[PDB]
Amino acid sequence: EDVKSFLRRNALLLLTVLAVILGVVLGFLLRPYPLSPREVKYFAFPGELLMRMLKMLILPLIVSSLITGLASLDAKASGRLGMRAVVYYMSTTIIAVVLGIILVLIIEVLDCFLDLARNIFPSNLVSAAFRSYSTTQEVEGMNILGLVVFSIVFGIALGKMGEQGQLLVDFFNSLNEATMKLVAIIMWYAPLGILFLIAGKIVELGMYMVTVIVGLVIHGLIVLPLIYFLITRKNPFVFIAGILQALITALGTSSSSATLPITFKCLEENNGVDKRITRFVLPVGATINMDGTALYEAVAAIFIAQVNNGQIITISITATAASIGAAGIPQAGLVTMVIVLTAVGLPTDDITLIIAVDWLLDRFRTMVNVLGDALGAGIVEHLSRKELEKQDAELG
Amino acid sequence: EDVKSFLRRNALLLLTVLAVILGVVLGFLLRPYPLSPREVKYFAFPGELLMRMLKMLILPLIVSSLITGLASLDAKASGRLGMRAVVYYMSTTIIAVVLGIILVLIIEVLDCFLDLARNIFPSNLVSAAFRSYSTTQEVEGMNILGLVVFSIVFGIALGKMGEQGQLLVDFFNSLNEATMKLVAIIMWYAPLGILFLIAGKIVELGMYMVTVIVGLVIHGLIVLPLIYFLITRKNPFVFIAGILQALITALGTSSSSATLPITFKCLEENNGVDKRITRFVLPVGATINMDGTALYEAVAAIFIAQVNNGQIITISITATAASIGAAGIPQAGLVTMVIVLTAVGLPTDDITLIIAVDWLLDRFRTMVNVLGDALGAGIVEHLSRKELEKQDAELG
Amino acid sequence: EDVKSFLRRNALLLLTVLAVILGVVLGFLLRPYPLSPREVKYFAFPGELLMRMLKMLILPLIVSSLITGLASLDAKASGRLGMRAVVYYMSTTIIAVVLGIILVLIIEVLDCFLDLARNIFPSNLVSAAFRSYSTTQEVEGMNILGLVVFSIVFGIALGKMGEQGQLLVDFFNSLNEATMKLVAIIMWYAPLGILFLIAGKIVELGMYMVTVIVGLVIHGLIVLPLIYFLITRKNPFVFIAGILQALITALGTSSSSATLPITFKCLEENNGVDKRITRFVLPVGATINMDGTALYEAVAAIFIAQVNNGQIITISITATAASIGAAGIPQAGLVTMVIVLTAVGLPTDDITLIIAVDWLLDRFRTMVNVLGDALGAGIVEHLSRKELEKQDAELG
Numbered sequence A, B, C: 001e002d003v004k005s006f007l008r009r010n011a012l013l014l015l016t017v018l019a020v021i022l023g024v025v026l027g028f029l030l031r032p033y034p035l036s037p038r039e040v041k042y043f044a045f046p047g048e049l050l051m052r053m054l055k056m057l058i059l060p061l062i063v064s065s066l067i068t069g070l071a072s073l074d075a076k077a078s079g080r081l082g083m084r085a086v087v088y089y090m091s092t093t094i095i096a097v098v099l100g101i102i103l104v105l106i107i108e109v110l111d112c113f114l115d116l117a118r119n120i121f122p123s124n125l126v127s128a129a130f131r132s133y134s135t136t137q138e139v140e141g142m143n144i145l146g147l148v149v150f151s152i153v154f155g156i157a158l159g160k161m162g163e164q165g166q167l168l169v170d171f172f173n174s175l176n177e178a179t180m181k182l183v184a185i186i187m188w189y190a191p192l193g194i195l196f197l198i199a200g201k202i203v204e205l206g207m208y209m210v211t212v213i214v215g216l217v218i219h220g221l222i223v224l225p226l227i228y229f230l231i232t233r234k235n236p237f238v239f240i241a242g243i244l245q246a247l248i249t250a251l252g253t254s255s256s257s258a259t260l261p262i263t264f265k266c267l268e269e270n271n272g273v274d275k276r277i278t279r280f281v282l283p284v285g286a287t288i289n290m291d292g293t294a295l296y297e298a299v300a301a302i303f304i305a306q307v308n309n310g311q312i313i314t315i316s317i318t319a320t321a322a323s324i325g326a327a328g329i330p331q332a333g334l335v336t337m338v339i340v341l342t343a344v345g346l347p348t349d350d351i352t353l354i355i356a357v358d359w360l361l362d363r364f365r366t367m368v369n370v371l372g373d374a375l376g377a378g379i380v381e382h383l384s385r386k387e388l389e390k391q392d393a394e395l396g
């Protein structure tokens, strides 16, 4: 009887679920036909248009979110909110790497460190907005990390100054809300885009793919929800229902940085999470908090060691280190595996074998990477209760 | 007796007319001499300096004009102003294509649609400001269309929010006026630049060139002025005298997007047109309203059919479609002719024959493209009388 | 007895002096070892990280400084402050070229003028922030001159408008202070960076190197200090002690444009110089006022003439002209020597011989280039006394 009101209310959520169900059907139907690379690009195009729309809003989001996020909070309160986030991030990326290692047991690398260091401190801000550094020397594609860093320091700087800083805070606050109004339009195209984005990909190792997928279920649907209930004492699967549009889009894009604007609209609107805490937890979580990637890094390094064959402590240290370094971009998990392979001693040429089934694992690990930030905000919000209480009463 | 006051008042206008008269003389004098490509570039340089100055101001103009233009107007009033503009644009591009077809009778193409679609939704705003998409994949040169789209949606978003949006409206209003103060300095260099810009070009098919030029006179000096008198009931050749500096510069540059800042100063200062309506009509008209290009597209497709040899309805549909797609950049008419040739069935390799005389036709068709936007603003302003009456009295 | 308080107070200044002393020691110790180019890059990396941090802040500094600098001053007062600066700049670059010529006596070039002219008027502002023009055609690296020009005109434009302009002035004032708060963090990394930046360079003509170095001492420590005492009637070597951190960093970077944010913090904090005058004198001085380069240009053109062999007036005219054209970037002195060699008649291929010892002379000539701007601000501030008196009392 009550399923009619469920169809009327969850209309946009159900259309995106149907987009996955019908998108998988469409792809397998069109798969036997001539798989021409130019034709595959044309077929997947309605999914490419959604990707462009989402990519567009990440820069005015990341920048405006952290500048207001850190300036709208008290001096030490900004540090406390950050400490809570960092403590949460490093523990979750440690639980996933430990859970990942146990499961797999049952079933130019210096240039990487330098390029990362170079990107933390960009030589040009206008460049940083569309270019990243990759020594061969500046490859195309936004330097998210470099902008996240600069925005954090810039936010602190406006917080340091008085009413002079207030103008820019108000400027960046108006710019945040305006781009957030645009992600409402992006959300309506999402059912159409998600269909073609996943149909195109399913158009384009046995135990391994299983170990990772099952490993992500134990972490994502059993480990992380328990952490939320242990801190907030609220039902985590009702919270996951709010951010469900953000997970379905993370499956489609396979880029947590690309689905960041929808996770903002899901945490801010569908759930009762504060903007003052989502403006910090979500942009930082999108680039450093990667639980799904950390689990994948550990399993994939030991899976190649199952064929090639005590020092799993270095693997747990570097797989958690690779999870931080890795980009909120798709296929970033296989390129950062160079660090975890060279550390143990295994050859980096073995990534080639995994590359084939990587695409599908990437879609699921992105969903767990997003989920960690989403449940993260809810955890940090509840913990930073008095900080938000002091800021609300102050205005009165 | 009264010609002395005419020389004192119209000093800058007369210097730009003299720039064309003396510029044509200078070019034909220097034409027999060694036409070295490096030497031609050096000779035309004072014209290249004007081009850089004008190109510079288009980005802070297009962006600041539409953001304030759509936010400073009421919800449905913004839609009404737009409806009036769109109705005016599509009818004028239909009259020109019909007039063009009658006169000529008397005397990778999917990748184009995809690249256009890609550009309507840019993946990066900082990139969009100096790069356009052109699959082979991101060519240099501003994505005007992508910025016009985003600015329109961003304007609407600030209009949607209340007083929070007002700060950014005021910010973008100050930024519009400041760049408009700079186009006053650009206007003084214009007589010097226009001389060398046209002298250099005249230094660098019989019936065809005539059909187009005569076709643009019937449309520009007889069709469009009659439309203005039919709606406003005001003398159109006194209005054309106000925007006369913008037409002379359109002849020189051959880029309606480049002469957009001067058409703003001509419509806002020389004529009594409202900023609230020029901020929408002029930037949108510069990229989609191309009457001179639509007339050219129809004549050039049938001129090649006069040699190569019922279905002129597809030509009228795609030539009007090419007019929208075409860029406010020079030589954009010959590249968009691919769409109108493939639609009818004629070969795209026939554009090569036309390319020679194209340059001079481009200068005249740009003047008609600008004229359509200029007389367009005057037409839409007069029609949207009550909308501006309600906004003025509200402030009181 | 008083040396203990001298160590406590001048802690950051002494750490940067020690950075040079220990940096020269470190380099000569590591010099005999395999000098691999990839290894040299890795070794110098902590110096490369400082360079990125400093480069980062130049764009939001140059732009925000001149826009507020010229808008916060009266119409003719802006012209007077400028006249004082221009008169000071051209006389100092004339004294250095005269002093340089006397000492050396005792002991595609049109494309350069066009590229400079092109860069004074950039075709795109977003591009200008990370790209310069260099015909072969748009090379990577910020167009400082093009941004300095545009910012000056934009500042004047906000000054021209009333309270409408005030919002953007306040916006650019908040943006200036916020980036100036960031150069405090950059200053703490500077001792670590300066050590590796100079150690790496000392790891990588007899009379000539001496003539230039001795020539810079006569100008920098005898000519320029006397000018300050002659105008301000204040001790110049107490003023040099304030901007001493900016000189030590100019030695390290060899780029006056890169050390511009630290010279701002030195003149604004360590010395009692007004922001209203440093916001104009320092960014303009960084690109056009190059006393150390002008002295170098004259000596290097006549040193090649000492080997290869009345018309030294053209050398003094073009060496002062090259000093203006030259970039606040390292090794910009040898590339601009093409202008001064072609003018006299000497071959440009002779720059190859000088290139070897150029690096060390560049570090010293940058220190004199910075010093001229630093003592320049102090000279112009004292001269524009009443202008600042009228602006202060007005607010009361």
Ligand SMILES: N[C@@H](CC(=O)O)C(=O)O
Pocket: A254, A255, A256, A257, A290, A293, A326, A327, A328, A329, A330, A331, A332, A333, A334, A362, A365, A366, A369
């Ligand atoms: N796709 C992941 C990163 C990766 O593991 O490739 C993300 O966007 O978070």
Ligand SMILES: N[C@@H](CC(=O)O)C(=O)O
Pocket: B254, B255, B256, B257, B290, B293, B326, B327, B328, B329, B330, B331, B332, B333, B334, B362, B365, B366, B369
């Ligand atoms: N030159 C025209 C476009 C074209 O037809 O090439 C304009 O700028 O409007």
Ligand SMILES: N[C@@H](CC(=O)O)C(=O)O
Pocket: C254, C255, C256, C257, C290, C293, C326, C327, C328, C329, C330, C331, C332, C333, C334, C362, C365, C366, C369
């Ligand atoms: N290095 C100098 C320029 C040069 O002479 O190379 C400066 O930055 O001012």
Ligand code: NA
Pocket: A286, A287, A288, A289, A290, A322, A323, A324, A325, A326, A327, A328
């Ligand atoms: Na990460």
Ligand code: NA
Pocket: B286, B287, B288, B289, B290, B322, B323, B324, B325, B326, B327, B328
């Ligand atoms: Na068009």
Ligand code: NA
Pocket: C286, C287, C288, C289, C290, C322, C323, C324, C325, C326, C327, C328
């Ligand atoms: Na200079």
